[PDB]
Amino acid sequence: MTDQAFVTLTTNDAYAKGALVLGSSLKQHRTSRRLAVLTTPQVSDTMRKALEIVFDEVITVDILDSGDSAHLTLMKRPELGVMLTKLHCWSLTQYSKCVFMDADTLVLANIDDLFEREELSAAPDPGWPDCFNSGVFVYQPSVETYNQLLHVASEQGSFDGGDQGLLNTFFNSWATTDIRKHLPFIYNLSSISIYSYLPAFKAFGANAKVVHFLGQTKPWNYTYDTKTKSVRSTHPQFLNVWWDIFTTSVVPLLQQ
Amino acid sequence: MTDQAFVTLTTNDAYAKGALVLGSSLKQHRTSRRLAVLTTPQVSDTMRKALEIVFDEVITVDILDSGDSAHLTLMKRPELGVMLTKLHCWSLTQYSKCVFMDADTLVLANIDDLFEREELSAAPDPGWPDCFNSGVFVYQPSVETYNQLLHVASEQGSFDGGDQGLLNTFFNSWATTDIRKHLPFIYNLSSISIYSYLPAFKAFGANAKVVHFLGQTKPWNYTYDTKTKSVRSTHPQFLNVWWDIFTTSVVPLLQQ
Ligand SMILES: O=c1ccn([C@@H]2O[C@H](COP(=O)(O)OP(=O)(O)O[C@H]3O[C@H](CO)[C@@H](O)[C@H](O)[C@H]3O)[C@@H](O)[C@H]2O)c(=O)[nH]1
Ligand SMILES: O=c1ccn([C@@H]2O[C@H](COP(=O)(O)OP(=O)(O)O[C@H]3O[C@H](CO)[C@@H](O)[C@H](O)[C@H]3O)[C@@H](O)[C@H]2O)c(=O)[nH]1
Ligand SMILES: [Cl-]
Numbered sequence: 150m151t152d153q154a155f156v157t158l159t160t161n162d163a164y165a166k167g168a169l170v171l172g173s174s175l176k177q178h179r180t181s182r183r184l185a186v187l188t189t190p191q192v193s194d195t196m197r198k199a200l201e202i203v204f205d206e207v208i209t210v211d212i213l214d215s216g217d218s219a220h221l222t223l224m225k226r227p228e229l230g231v232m233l234t235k236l237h238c239w240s241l242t243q244y245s246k247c248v249f250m251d252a253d254t255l256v257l258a259n260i261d262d263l264f265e266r267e268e269l270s271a272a273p274d275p276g277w278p279d280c281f282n283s284g285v286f287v288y289q290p291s292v293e294t295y296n297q298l299l300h301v302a303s304e305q306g307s308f309d310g311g312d313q314g315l316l317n318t319f320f321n322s323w324a325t326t327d328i329r330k331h332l333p334f335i336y337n338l339s340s341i342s343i344y345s346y347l348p349a350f351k352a353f354g355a356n357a358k359v360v361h362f363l364g365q366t367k368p369w370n371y372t373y374d375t376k377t378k379s380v381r382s383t384h385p386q387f388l389n390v391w392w393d394i395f396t397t398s399v400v401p402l403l404q405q
Numbered sequence: 406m407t408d409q410a411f412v413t414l415t416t417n418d419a420y421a422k423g424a425l426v427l428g429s430s431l432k433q434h435r436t437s438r439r440l441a442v443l444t445t446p447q448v449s450d451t452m453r454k455a456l457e458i459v460f461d462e463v464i465t466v467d468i469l470d471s472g473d474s475a476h477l478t479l480m481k482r483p484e485l486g487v488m489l490t491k492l493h494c495w496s497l498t499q500y501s502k503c504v505f506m507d508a509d510t511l512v513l514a515n516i517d518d519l520f521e522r523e524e525l526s527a528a529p530d531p532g533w534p535d536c537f538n539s540g541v542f543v544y545q546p547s548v549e550t551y552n553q554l555l556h557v558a559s560e561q562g563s564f565d566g567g568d569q570g571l572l573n574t575f576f577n578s579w580a581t582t583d584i585r586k587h588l589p590f591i592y593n594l595s596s597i598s599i600y601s602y603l604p605a606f607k608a609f610g611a612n613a614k615v616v617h618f619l620g621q622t623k624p625w626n627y628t629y630d631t632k633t634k635s636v637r638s639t640h641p642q643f644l645n646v647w648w649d650i651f652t653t654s655v656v657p658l659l660q661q
């Protein structure tokens with residue numbers, strides 16, 4: 150509990166909003182775990198200070214700096230910057246186990262039971278469901294694993310240009326091994342899927358614990374009417390939760 | 406082997422073409438198992454005779470007939486006709502274990518190793534990957550299970566208007582139980598996914614054992630140029646395999 154953390158990532162100010170909403174949603178649902186966020190120097194000082202309030206720990210990662218372990222890998226594969234920054238989540242050995250969550254996720258219920266899971270546990274990716282979606286995963290910080298991941302990144306890159314490809318390649322037994330490493334889809338519910346299989350969403354969507362705003366269009370790319378408490382024209386329910394947290398908890402926090 | 410079967414289903418002539426191509430693809434890849442097809446009286450006599458050549462067993466199911474076990478359920482839920490017909494796959498107790506395959510699937514490699522699997526084994530559905538896709542599944546014929554499925558169909562119907570919803574509801578432990586009941590996605594590769602996650606298809610698509618032509622547009626809805634051996638404007642590779650089998654093996658069979 151005290152050495153377990155939800156870990157997110159923001160490399161800019163737009164995703165910082167996501168991270169702040171995510172962080173707030175975790176607090177709203179009374180996590181007993183630490184909240185940690187990987188940030189980069191490209192995150193402005195005001196977003197950083199807001200992150201320092203919402204999160205227990207704000208970690209600055211500067212892969213553009215030569216002193217960074219991932220930097221050499223970035224020079225080789227400069228398109229892999231976000232991924233390489235994300236991989237620093239494994240560097241957080243002050244924690245024994247973390248749930249990584251993308252900054253464009255949103256928690257709708259307490260998900261501390263994720264810490265029962267082992268590395269690497271993740272929900273299936275829609276589209277290619279023998280890959281896990283790397284938007285939400287349970288992992289164990291380890292310099293060793295970090296180094297191994299960096300090594301694979303350097304050598305092979307990523308089959309999809311992002312962390313997801315690399316993580317699937319590295320944690321490649323996921324599809325065929327240990328059903329407990331399949332997180333229920335409701336722990337990483339693709340916002341695309343809330344219309345991609347409408348009947349299944351109708352059937353099981355009320356059980357959503359985490360919504361993952363895949364895009365294209367992120368929640369902060371919408372216009373939200375604070376009077377009608379709804380985004381302006383998907384079924385907006387989740388966007389509206391995001392915006393309510395953003396409006397209620399995050400914006401007042403930033404107003405300095 | 407002798408009492409195991411691939412089982413498909415056709416309720417009309419268009420899907421009969423699918424079934425004939427599927428059946429042919431299974432023979433082309435040298436299955437040691439029986440090939441069985443559920444047909445309805447709505448399947449014309451010429452398609453039926455072709456099916457009798459390709460398949461070891463052609464089973465006629467007429468849920469419109471009062472004598473059919475499913476008929477009462479059809480009267481109650483008449484939109485569930487295709488599903489109710491499909492469920493008769495469980496009535497095929499002359500087989501100890503079957504792989505049900507939709508008539509719009511296509512086999513690209515021998516998949517007899519599916520018979521190692523237990524009921525209910527199926528690949529994840531893209532879109533909502535905690536549901537299995539009912540296009541391809543390993544099951545054990547049983548009047549008992551058939552009756553139980555019919556009972557659930559009668560009582561609850563299907564959350565998606567088709568067999569998939571009902572099968573997921575009935576075989577509801579799939580998502581959380583026994584990784585061996587997750588068939589690799591390559592045993593039921595959604596044709597939608599061959600562009601939905603292009604990088605993953607690029608990475609793993611060459612391993613495709615079964616392509617499942619989800620639609621909208623079925624392989625027989627395309628125009629195929631027999632000179633260029635390609636469908637006229639997806640990546641057409643799989644459509645072209647389908648059409649080559651259709652052109653090479655199925656059409657000459659029907660020319661009576
Ligand atoms: O400019 C950026 C881009 C990404 N991120 C971080 O990296 C995560 C992933 O990027 P995101 O924009 O959320 O990507 P998605 O729209 O969720 O989709 C990508 O990321 C998913 C999970 O990481 C994969 O399933 C997809 O295939 C891939 O396209 C974000 O949530 C952030 O935490 C940033 O901080 N800044
Ligand atoms: O008029 C019909 C319709 C269906 N079938 C049979 O039933 C199967 C399922 O129908 P199909 O047209 O292939 O549906 P799909 O395009 O594959 O999609 C449906 O069926 C899938 C698996 O059964 C589910 O994953 C989807 O959610 C559902 O929309 C077919 O392959 C045939 O075997 C017929 O014989 N005649
Ligand atoms: Cl298991």
Ligand SMILES: [Mn+2]
Pocket residue numbers: 251252253254284361362363
């Ligand atoms: Mn994301």
Ligand SMILES: [Mn+2]
Pocket residue numbers: 507508509510540617618619
């Ligand atoms: Mn189908």
